[PDB]
Amino acid sequence: PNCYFPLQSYGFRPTYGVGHQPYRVVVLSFELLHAPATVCGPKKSTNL
Amino acid sequence: FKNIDGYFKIYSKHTPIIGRDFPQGFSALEPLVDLPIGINITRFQTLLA
Ligand SMILES: *[C@@H]1O[C@H](CO)[C@@H](O)[C@H](O)[C@H]1NC(C)=O
Numbered sequence A: 001p002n003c004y005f006p007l008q009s010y011g012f013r014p015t016y017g018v019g020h021q022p023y024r025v026v027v028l029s030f031e032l033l034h035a036p037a038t039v040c041g042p043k044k045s046t047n048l
Numbered sequence B: 001f002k003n004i005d006g007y008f009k010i011y012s013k014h015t016p017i018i019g020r021d022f023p024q025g026f027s028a029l030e031p032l033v034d035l036p037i038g039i040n041i042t043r044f045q046t047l048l049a
Helices: none
Strands: B008-014 B030-035
Touching: none
Parallel strands: none
Antiparallel strands: B008 B030
16 A cells, blocks of 8 residues: 555456457657658569 | 768779889779768778788
8 A cells, every 4th residue: 555566467368358458559650851761662663 | 982961982993003002094983882871970090900
């Protein structure tokens, strides 16, 4: 009491509701500013 | 070497040495690599063996 551990768990089991399932989240952060381009999209090539 | 708008450029050309170390005949210089450095190059140094 009055002394709480900072972190608790995400106890995950195969049987919950959708709101409690272990969702896998991956976020992509881009830097679209004026700087030398380093990562680019899959530019498409064709015949001649 | 040069650092225009970053994009460090290196040009090299190896000529089998003749009698003169730094002689005079013309020798073209070809690029080797160009990759985006983007840092304030002001000082320069060399390494030995
Ligand atoms: C150093 O290089 C970076 C690369 O963009 C640039 O933002 C900065 O302005 C340069 N330094 C100076 C004093 O211009």
